[PDB]
Design a protein around this ligand. Structure first.
Ligand SMILES: [Br-]
Ligand SMILES: [Br-]
Ligand SMILES: [Cl-]
Ligand SMILES: [Cl-]
Length: 288
């Protein structure tokens, strides 16, 4: 079996999508019409560092990941058995599973990036060396009560999120723990995937009711539940993703439990492939 995984924030890169925009001129056109600016020039020229501003990052990755997928299935004449994507990438999983049409997905990611671009006074940090339960127990033991787990990315790679002062305290606490080897601050100024996103999630949820969705043709493993999307809950699960943790390791472990599972990262970079490598190697280790 094969799963296609689609990357999110941090995998954008000037030069992303080179060749694809001219090869899919119909869809490139459709994206420029919606956005009001050239998606190709944003990606290949990165005017004014715009690729690293979320209101533009999210359309840019969604378009490059979508055209990457269309190129790959056309050249290989195969579709994947399952799809998933990390944060923003879940919109590209839903596009591959025909849950909405190309233009619809772009309007959703444009709105998502606008809402997230207005969030301030937050921070997120990637803690390396503790597993999910150890970070949850530490936030309790050490009274970091206003910090949330935002991503569970690899067996020992957890992202925490909260207001900026509380995240700097929590990062420094984690740096004193025995098994923590690095705490890296993420390039964001909002507490994404946390309780501080509750108002943005309510706004986005209401927004989704104007759009048109269809039952997936490929199962989409959701970030909120690490189980397939169902049609009647698709808008609630997509909105829920904004204020809940991304359960990436449980998503990939549910796919591996099926048996011989291949993963292919579709879009720029190799971030998800690196996470999957650590999830597979950890699954081969026994308890002690
Ligand atoms: Br091009
Ligand atoms: Br790891
Ligand atoms: Cl982003
Ligand atoms: Cl669902």
């Amino acid at each position: 079996m094969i799963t296609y995984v689609f990357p999110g924030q941090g995998s954008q890169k000037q030069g992303m999508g080179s060749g694809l925009f001219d090869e899919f001129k119909e869809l490139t056109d459709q994206a420029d019409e919606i956005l009001g600016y050239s998606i190709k020039r944003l990606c290949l020229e990165n005017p004014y560092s715009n690729l690293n501003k979320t209101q533009f990052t999210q359309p840019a990755l969604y378009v490059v990941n979508a055209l990457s997928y269309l190129k790959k299935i056309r050249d290989e004449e195969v579709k994947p058995d399952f799809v998933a994507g990390h944060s923003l990438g879940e919109y590209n999983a839903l596009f591959a599973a025909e849950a909405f049409d190309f233009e619809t997905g772009l309007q959703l990611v444009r709105k998502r990036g606008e809402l997230m671009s207005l969030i301030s006074n937050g921070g997120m940090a990637a803690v390396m060396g503790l597993n999910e339960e150890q970070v949850a127990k530490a936030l309790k033991e050490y009274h970091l009560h206003d910090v949330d787990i935002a991503n569970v990315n690899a067996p020992y790679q957890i992202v925490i999120s909260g207001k900026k002062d509380e995240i700097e305290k929590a990062a420094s606490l984690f740096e004193t723990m025995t098994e923590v080897t690095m705490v890296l601050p993420l390039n964001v100024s909002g507490a994404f995937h946390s309780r501080y996103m509750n108002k943005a999630k309510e706004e986005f949820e209401e927004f989704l009711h104007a759009f048109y969705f269809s039952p997936p043709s490929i199962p989409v493993i959701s970030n909120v539940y690490a189980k397939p999307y169902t049609y009647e809950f698709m808008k609630q699960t997509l909105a829920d993703q904004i204020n809940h943790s991304v359960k990436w390791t449980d998503s990939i472990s549910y796919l591996m439990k099926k048996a011989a599972m291949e993963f292919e990262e579709v879009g720029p970079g190799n971030v998800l492939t690196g996470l999957i490598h650590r999830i597979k190697k950890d699954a081969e280790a026994m308890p002690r």
